[PDB]
Symmetry: none
Subunit: 103 residues, 2 copies
């Protein structure tokens, strides 16, 4: 349920967190850079090009936004339930994603 | 519980809705003007100076953000459960608050 608010609150470890409508859900931004997406009541983290290609080769699938039969494959991967139980770990995952998003 | 998400969706008619860390919670902005705040799992609406002054005289208390003994009194008043349960009316209240803020 309160996944959006709980995500934004957790990631304040990265400074001010901003959100706006992105890809059918809500994007999360730090330092003017999107690093996360909350959609289908699930937290997703941004994989850079290299990470996303690898993930796909290894059988993982990113979130896809659809409208009237037009799909948009995103760079956003649903996190595991276990990661949520691991607050500091998840914070580090977001920090690394934000870092890769800025490169 | 997803007050924030629900609120961001509810207020889509007012303008483009964005949120950000504000005053210990999350501020809601319509085309760059803040009109609401989600904190303490409750939606709060912005009262302009006149409204807030009247409210305090009339025994109502705004949300106060506090860190390490430093309190910051805000202009944000918690809505009633009845108003939260009355979607169209809440949109109009937010719309007025936004007008008052501009
Ligand atoms: Mg990239
Ligand atoms: Mg929420």
């Amino acid at each position: 349920k309160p996944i959006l608010k709980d995500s934004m609150k957790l990631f304040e470890a990265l400074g001010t967190i901003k959100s706006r409508s992105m890809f059918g859900g809500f994007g999360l931004f730090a330092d003017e850079t999107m690093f996360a997406l909350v959609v289908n009541n699930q937290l997703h983290i941004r994989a850079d090009q290299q990470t996303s290609s690898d993930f796909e080769t290894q059988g993982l699938k990113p979130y896809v936004y659809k409208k009237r039969g037009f799909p948009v494959v995103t760079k956003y991967y649903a996190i595991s339930s276990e990661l949520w139980e691991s607050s500091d770990r998840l914070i580090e995952v977001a920090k690394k994603s934000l870092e890769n998003a800025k490169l």
